[model samples]
Target: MTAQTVTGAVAAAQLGATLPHEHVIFGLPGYAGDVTLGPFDHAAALASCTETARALLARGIQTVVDATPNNCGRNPAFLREVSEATGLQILCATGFFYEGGGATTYFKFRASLGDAESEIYEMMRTEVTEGIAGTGIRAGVIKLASSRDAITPYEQLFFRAAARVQRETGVPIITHTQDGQQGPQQAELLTSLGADPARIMIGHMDGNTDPAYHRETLRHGVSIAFDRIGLQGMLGTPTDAERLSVLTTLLGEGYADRLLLSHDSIWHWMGRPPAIPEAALPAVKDWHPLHISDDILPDLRRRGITEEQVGQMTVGNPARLFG
Candidate 1:
């Protein structure tokens, strides 16, 4: 199967050096309506996001999977514009963010009325098979998210919606796990619902440093993504040193084919520019797309990881998502 992209169909083999998880642009729910940051600046946003896309192009990243959830500012038109300007292959997602942090009130209202299931299911299915917001730009993958420790009832509606969509359209599924939680359970929920285990990815596993977490989740027959490659020790995430230790150990244990890597950095923080303080700088210093190429890969090489293993995570694994 071809990996559906913003520009159209791209065969898996053509997706070289793909960052399977990243945000070209992101905004929290209600950012557009926030009085403090109202009046979204189109030209500035286009220029800034285009620049980020070009930087990824220069770094030789051929494809990017945009995991921004639906109500969290998943802008298909803007993403397509960035793709056109920079010649980047972008796979936009279709699904909601986690309930607590996402625009869940709308769906929750529908749930209260007992109409949420069909409404969300049809929305995702239509986005995949038809197109997003009449752009004729179908989402290449389905995205799902849950609360920190468990899948909320409201969030489970989306999982049900997308699992059936995955069954029908064969579009792949990527997911969000809050603060390193529920990777194993996320794997089981989607697969038990009959979504193809191989095409489903339980993402943000890097947030958990425990080897046993990786060990149990790794055996569940779904693709796993350490998509937060450069993030370190912020909000329950472990340091990169801890990340690498477990990463190399997992590589040694031969889970390369199921692992994909990316830094989940955003090109634009929509509502307001982050006001990061000096003391917290270490948490975000290396939090950019280039961290993988400039730092992580070289570190992996020094530790005696072979080129082929790198290829699996960077190339082969993400490609297999299409199949």
Candidate 2:
């Protein structure tokens, strides 16, 4: 009834171009009650994000969806500074992460699932409407995440809340899935709960090279996110060469438009060295597919993927999602 009465701020693109998924800053370890803790250093954080923003701008990336959820260190002020310094659009989000299911105290305070749903809907509405409480830059997309399992009882609640938010608002959803299998399940759960499948992005779909997984996901009319293109060595994940080859296979099978790619190379605030246990030391050290905008595309081209395919995944698809 009444066209479902959507809520959330409409988007306007001041940023010159768009990269749908990028981590300008994150404090996931800190949020999980891990080793990272200290006095809040706004000045230092803003300065670091500014540096990252400049690098992104130099690569012609005008806007970035900083897909860090609440417990994962979503800093609205830092985003504001990035927007000011680099003349880039820094879109932020208002969702929660599964850091041990994220702040049980906050969840308990909200009481029932309906209460939590309303709170989430209003929080997202505020992000789009009020410009993240202080920052003038409004969020251009709604971000969601799930840990290793599909619809963990804890995550099912989150999915239902996210679905209600989407039902009441036209904003698109960007979801995180560890590895890859959980993505299809998460997408189906959201859609079954009334979210538009086309308005959803199942992120991190490149952790494997399964054509059946890609085919099943695409058949549902949803987008597939290959957003970890540059974090292979850091997370002991696969390489750009391998992921690009997967893309080539998928595209040859005619599934190009349903894809999006990003580095997911977060600057860890914990100050730990960016290396995983199983990977070679310092080979692709701090970041993988190092020059995401420069080197990776050329490598793909050499591997027989075209510039048009690169543009669709990097440029065209993001525009379609966040615009």
Candidate 3:
């Protein structure tokens, strides 16, 4: 029998051949009223995105799961247009993000968890079956997030809705932990609600250091995703050298198969806002870590980490979870 193409892949591709999490287009807060970043110029943005994606593809990347949600500019039409330009599969996401400071979530404002579940499920179902708003593009994963360690009431509701989606569709979940402490808890909550542990990826794991803590997460049967590797240096000074050290060490400990890597780099061409709220801004400035994937891998190779090992974390692991 021929291979089966999973949700994210253009075809039946393997996991170890994927970049599980990354954004092709994204914008910070204040992006709606402020168009200084030029969100309107899709043709220009698409051209730039194609060039950057070409660089990533040359670095051995086959697929990029664009984690930009509806709230953050999930332009399925532009994604389809880019795929045509670059010949690369760009997976999209469906979910809700935090509103911060009394701001209302779409779910909380219009409906309860039950109502939100139906909305997310229908959005996902429609994307997978009919195509995103008739653009003929499909979302490969469902995106969800929590703010900091405090899982707000709205977040709890969203998680339940997300779990319902997972139970119904088997689409993998990509989560943004306000920090690392909350990831495992989110995993626990989702698992308790009948969400498959294997299908969840707790993102931004690089912010924390307790390997034992991460290992414990793996014991819960969820994959640990390390996003924002380049920004670590500015926050905690986790330079390329330090990131490789942790990655290689994790590989040495046999967690390589469970790890997924990405720059999480949103090219500036996507029209991000000039200023994000202080809370939303990461602890660093001028820190475009994901932008360094091309050089970082070569540096790792020099440090004795083989191409296959990097491929396992970057490609193999993500393909398995998302597929």
Candidate 4:
């Protein structure tokens, strides 16, 4: 089987050491209106993004899934450019973000006039079956998200629409769980709606360190993502110490096949550069993409995680999920 990329479709075997969740560039919905940052600088953006891909490739990462949602500054043409320059297989997503922090004004207003469900279903179906913005680049997966602690009224609509797309086509779905919440609910909803369990990945499982919580979601027979390996201290999220303990427990419990690993690193924050405060510098010190390759895996090895299990998380799991 093949996974779609910005450049073209490639076999899952080609996706070696894949990072299932990362962004080349990301911004919220209103990024474009902030002209005080000046015009969109494609020159600098392209250079930085290509450098990010090259660095990943240097660490032996062959594939990266750009999990930036549709309303959230997802640039497919730019992804293609970076891929062409750096020789990395980059996959883009095909759904809207969560209603809380994401853009919802247009869709909510449209829903007041017509059926939002059918419109979103067809829109996502078009992107998977046809192309995104006439760029002839297909989305490899459906990216849907739920707000923290609840699925919300309209996010249920987003999940339903994305589930319909997955059922109609063979495309897979990857999800966002705000602060590691609602993953079990997300899996239950998607599976009950008839999406294949094998084709769903509940992301951000690292935000919480409770093994019981992870096991509850994994009971549904879908994959769970430890994609936020390096982020810390926002929304009262757990530190990497908390993440690693639960991670090792899961591995000992024999759940390697269901684990997908990556860092949700953003190379470029569109519209402006991110300003890290001095006090918060320690919090985000390991927030970059290379943290997984450079730090986490080594720590895992020292904790008795073997190379075989490492491959299952880093390479084999993503291939099987997206294949």
Global lDDT of each candidate:
0.87, 0.67, 0.67, 0.89
TM-score of model 2 vs. true structure: 0.83
Which stretches in model 1 have alpha-carbon errors above 4 Å? 35-38
The residue-by-residue lDDT of candidate 2 on 1-323, one tens digit each, is: 01100122324433334566777767654443544644446677678767777877787886677787766766767666667776766667767775354554475456453476666667777765556666555565677777775556655666776777677776678888876667778777877888877678888888767778777777777898888876654454677677777887898886777887677767445343344555455534536223667777677788787878877777666666665
Q: lDDT per residue, candidate 3, 180-223, as tens digits?
A: 56777777888899998877888877766767767776777888
Give candidate 2's error at residue 322 in angstroms. Answer: 0.4
Q: Candidate 2 — worst ten consecutive residues by lDDT sum?
A: 1-10
The true-versus-predicted C-alpha distance at residue 313 of model 4, in Å, is 0.5
Backbone clash count for every predicted candidate, in the order shown: 0, 0, 11, 0
Query: Alpha carbon lDDT of residue 254, candidate 4?
Result: 96
Q: Name the top TM-score candidate.
A: 4
Clash pairs, candidate 1, are none
TM-scores of all candidate predictions against the true structure: 0.97, 0.83, 0.83, 0.98
Task: Rank the models by lDDT, top first.
Answer: 4, 1, 3, 2
> For all the candidates, what are their Cα RMSDs to the real structure?
1.3, 4.6, 4.1, 1.1
lDDT of 1 by residue, 134-162 (tens): 88998999999988979988888998888
